[PDB]
Each structure stands twice: as structure tokens, then as C-alpha cells.
Design a protein around this ligand. Sequence first.
Ligand SMILES: OC[C@H]1O[C@@H](O)[C@H](O)[C@@H](O)[C@H]1O
Ligand code: NA
Length: 601
Amino acid sequence: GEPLYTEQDLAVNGREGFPNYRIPALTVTPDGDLLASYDGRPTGIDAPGPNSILQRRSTDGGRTWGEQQVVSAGQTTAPIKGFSDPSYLVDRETGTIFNFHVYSQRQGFAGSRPGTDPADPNVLHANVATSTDGGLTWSHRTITADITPDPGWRSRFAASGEGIQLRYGPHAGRLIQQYTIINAAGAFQAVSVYSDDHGRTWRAGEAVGVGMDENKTVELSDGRVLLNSRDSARSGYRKVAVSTDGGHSYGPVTIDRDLPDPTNNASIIRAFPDAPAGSARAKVLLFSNAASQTSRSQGTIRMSCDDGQTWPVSKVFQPGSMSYSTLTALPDGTYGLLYEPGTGIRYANFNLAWLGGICAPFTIPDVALEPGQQVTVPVAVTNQSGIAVPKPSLQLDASPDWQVQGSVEPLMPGRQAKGQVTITVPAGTTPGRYRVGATLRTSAGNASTTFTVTVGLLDQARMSIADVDSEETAREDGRASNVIDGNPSTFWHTEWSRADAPGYPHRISLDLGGTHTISGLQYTRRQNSANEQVADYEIYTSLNGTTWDGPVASGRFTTSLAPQRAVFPARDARYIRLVALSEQTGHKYAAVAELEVEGQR
Ligand SMILES: OC[C@H]1O[C@@H](O)[C@H](O)[C@@H](O)[C@H]1O
Ligand code: NA
């Protein structure tokens, strides 16, 4: 009906007893009470810090909130004890509420030492506060032994937010709470901690991935359990994995490109928790995170209607600073959101009318053209339920002096619609990769996508490596071939340490895959490291591949994270070579994220 979005702060840094309030966790008790838990940081730091687990309660749907009570109190005086990162799990069958959190003594997550002994002050323990009276009183347990099946698991912490109780299949009733472990090999993995006896005993299942962190799980419409992870390896995205069992294991982990993330926590819940298996309502997910890849800001709620395959809906709830966010389905049909705005922890409530709308994900392919060209590309839209939409619009978002227009036929229930986009780009358009936003406007809600229009660059898929002076391939993936894959997150790296290899006259040559008239080369520095940045370069070209002619260009490029051009009077060439002569701060390695060649296909 009428759109709703209201907010209020539950904790304000400096007020009510603590200098710092962080890490939100939201839930709704069986009686309909809302419970909000967060850390109270007297020192403004996580574990080993003397943090406390607090709690505020709302008995009127989230409008008014009670006083801040303590769930797990940390000791500031020696010996120092702390409680951090809460995560709620409500057993809807029995009514018990679990608040999972970290119990620290001397070490935190990165410094915890092997062991399961509650007494050992050097391991980071996994605790659980249990309540059978709605959250009023709690009973504490240290469950580290129960969940550390492999002695190599030297550290752990429960991903804050809220866990889940399975409703479908043979493992229906099972409580699952996600964790992050540090194995023997030093790797950060994800593991599900579950209980089949309503929480009396907790076992850990099989660990997943490498470079994982705070992860989240949801039950799909068919009973499958999807996992959505923060990526410690910082690719600017969420890692996802899925499971089909009850001794818990997930298949391969992959990066989801529809979900940008600045390596931060995020929520993913079932929009209709009590829907039947297989139904449309059972397929609707809500995900909240910070959409920025360089900052913890641009907090946005996204919506899926096909179990997480597509994410057509999105809307920003906090354009400004936004870090951790947690979601919860309220019994009135709305959704509760607890997040970090930089001032502490704030509570928000919104309904689906406020999101925009329409479950009509659409695809528009990636286009390559020469400046001064026009191209028309097809649009394919997949439609949802009570949606017979006779007049939908297509609003494209591009560079102002580019003419972009689009149209789509009507949307009929359960059918696919067709359409097209015409892009005309001017002759003086600088070669590059262009992101074009697409918005399917309809009187029943929003639906958006993005495609890429590449102007004036050759096709990398036709490119290969002719030669390279050195590639790091033992300790990491520093392959010369990572420059031609269209991903700034992967890089070529010169054979680095743990093998005292060559120094600076470094070089990489590309086989363009046929003769082309080229006038330039663009290069992108390695993004998350500053010590292998190329300074002085020289470009050489060739048609036979053995006799090289140049330097066709020379220069010193900057420390810019975006692509940098190296232009030269057009010429025919089958091969292009970049000779790196020095590094920005005199270091010995070279790493290039991407190499783009400007020319005519
Ligand atoms: O020795 C190579 C490595 O050195 C590290 O100090 C650096 O942070 C890494 O990005 C990698 O370059
Ligand atoms: Na790359």
C-alpha cells in the first residue's frame, strides 16, 4: 500500500554508558517482541577488548524501545573479559532464543592460539546465551569444544546478525548459525554450526572456501541452503556457495557480480519465512549491504524473486555512511533493519511498497562499437505474478553527449518480453569501458540492470601472451594472461620473493590475434597493493613478432587506479609490447591488473 520507511537510534556513541556501540543483531521473539542486541565497547575496540553484549526490547512492534540491559558483561579490570559480536537465533518450534557471541580474554580473532579449554585465556571462545523466557534472563555456555572438530581450527567467531531454523525437508527444525574459522594453513574459511536437538548440543559441519569472513545463510524455496559471504581477499563482491544437505557441506564458492561489497557484513533473509515449499513467495529474498566497493556507504536493500539468481530490485536506505546491517521479518508484514550509521546503532522499518518494485529482471548484452557508430541491441525481460503491464518504459543512464534510447513490449504474466536499445556514440569519444545503467519503469515498481559499451578497443578474447620476462605462479597467481581477462582484481606479477628473481627492465608482449590498426594502449595498476606500480614505460610494436619496432611511445605513468592511456600515431601491428623500466617507489616488481589495446576490430 502506502510506502513506509521510518528510523530511530537505539544507541548513540557516548550516551547511556559507552563511548562506542557497534555490531547489530535483530530478532522477533515468539510473542512478537522485537529484540535488538549490540556491543558496548568501553575502549572502542573489538576482542580482546572488555566489550559487553547489550539489549533493548520493543513490546509495541518497534515504536518505543525499553532500557539498555546487559546480556553478557565484560570485565574492564584484570583479568580482562569481553563479549562481542552478537547473533540471534530463535527456535520457532520450542520458543528458545539464542544469542551467539565471542568470549575473549587475552587474544582476539587474528591472535588466538590453538585450544578448546574454556580456561585457556589465549583462545577466542565461541559462547551462547540461551533464554527460555523471551530474552529476560540468560544462561551462558562456552561451546568451543563442541564446534572445533579439527585441532587446526585455531580461531572462530559467529557472524553477527541472525541465524536460521530450517523449515523444509528432512532437517526441518535445525538451527544454523554461521562461523568463520582460521585453519592450520592460516586460511579464513566459513562453517555452519547447527543443532538438531533444539540447541542442547551444537556440531560444526564441513568448512568452505579460502579468504572468507562473516557469512550468512538462507533457506531457498526447495530446501537448499545458500551461503553469502564477505570476502577477506577484497574483490569488491560477495562470495556465494550453496548446500543440499544435513551433515552440512557447500559446493564450490564463486563471486557474485550483482552484489558489490566493500568487504563488510550484510544481511540476506527470506521475505516470506512461512511460505510453502516451491511457491513464488518462498523464492523472494531481501539482501542489505553497502553497495559501494571502495567505501562503507550507500546502504541498499535489494530484492530477488528466483532464489537469488537475479537481483532486479534495489533502493538506497542510507546514501551516507553505512557499515553493518541486519534484517528481520516483522509479524506485521514489514521488515526491521538494524544498522551502523557511524553514530552507533540505528533501527529502521520499511515495507515492500517503499522498495520500488517489480520482479522483472532483464538482460541487455555487452556492446562493442567504433566511435561515431550507432548499434541496436536486444533486451530480454522475465516477468512475475499479477503483472500484466501494458506500458513499461526503458530509461538508460549514460554520458550526456551519447544518444541512448530503449523500448520494451508489454509485460504479460509469466512470459518473456522483448525490446531493444539504440546507442549512438560520437566520433570524438575516448576509447574505454563504459557502464550504462538501464531502468525498466512500470506503474508497479522498478527493475534495473547495467551493461557495458566498449568503444574503440580490441577484443581481449582474441589476445594471448607472446612473451613475458617473469610471472609469479608459485606463491600466488601473478600470471601474464591476467592482464587480458577484463578483471582489475586479477594481476600479472613478476616472480616475487621466495625466489630472488630479476629486477626492473621488465616486459610483457601481447599477440593481438591478427593484424590491426592500433593507436594506443591503456593500463590499470594493481589495485590493492602499491609497491609494484609501473613508472617509466616504452611501447614497441611488431607484425612478425621477432623484430620489434619502437619505442613508439615512452612516458612515466601515474599512481592512478583508473586506466591510463599511452597513445601513438595509428599504425598496423599484430603484436604490442610494454617495457617497464622502473617502479614508482623504486621497488623491484611489476604487476599489471589489465591491458587494453585501442584500435579497430
Ligand atoms: O612480496 C610480495 C607481497 O608482499 C606483501 O608485502 C604485499 O602486501 C603483497 O601485496 C605482495 O606484493
Ligand atoms: Na586482470
